[PDB]
Structure 1
Amino acid sequence: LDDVARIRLVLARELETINEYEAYARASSNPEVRAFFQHLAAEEKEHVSEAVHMLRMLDSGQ
């Protein structure tokens, strides 16, 4: 398990987390809860872009 492997693991986890945030926002009729989850999902998408950048830098094949 090297650095690129840990980056891939973090990216995979972030993608699943976004899925969870979107599903939980959809399940709520509370506007404040939906806003909470939409903000979290946006911050997680930022993290995804950052991880993909690090992966492309560190992985030649990617």
Structure 2
Amino acid sequence: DLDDVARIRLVLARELETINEYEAYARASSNPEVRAFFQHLAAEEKEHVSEAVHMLRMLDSGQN
């Protein structure tokens, strides 16, 4: 029994964990192309975080 706000919260949480993974893998790699690739993915995931927080702000009354 999820609603729209709950699904957005779930996507935001998943995105935050994904950023953790991207940064971990960038640190764990020593090939600079792989490192750069993971850093790029992490930055774009951070854009997704911003977008989901902004959606959450529009929809959720208790947050905004």
> Is the pair's TM-score, using the shorter chain for normalization, greater than 0.5?
yes
Provide TM-score, normalisation by structure 1.
0.99
Task: Using the aligned pairs only, state the percent identity.
Answer: 100
In structure 2, the gaps of 5 or more residues are: none
Q: For residues 55 and 29 of structure 2, what CA distance do their matches in structure 1 show? A: 34
Secondary structure of the structure 1 residue equivalent to 2:12: helix
Superposed counterparts of 1:1-62, under 5 Å:
1-62=2-63
* Aligned length in residues: 62
Runs ≥4 residues deviating over 2 A: none
Q: CA deviation at 1:37?
A: 0.2
- Deviation, 1:39, is 0.3
Unaligned runs of 5+ in 1: none
CA distance in 2: counterparts of 1:30 and 1:55, whole angstroms: 37
Deviation, 1:51, is: 0.1
Distance 1:25 1:39 in 2: 10
TM-score by length of structure 2 reads 0.96
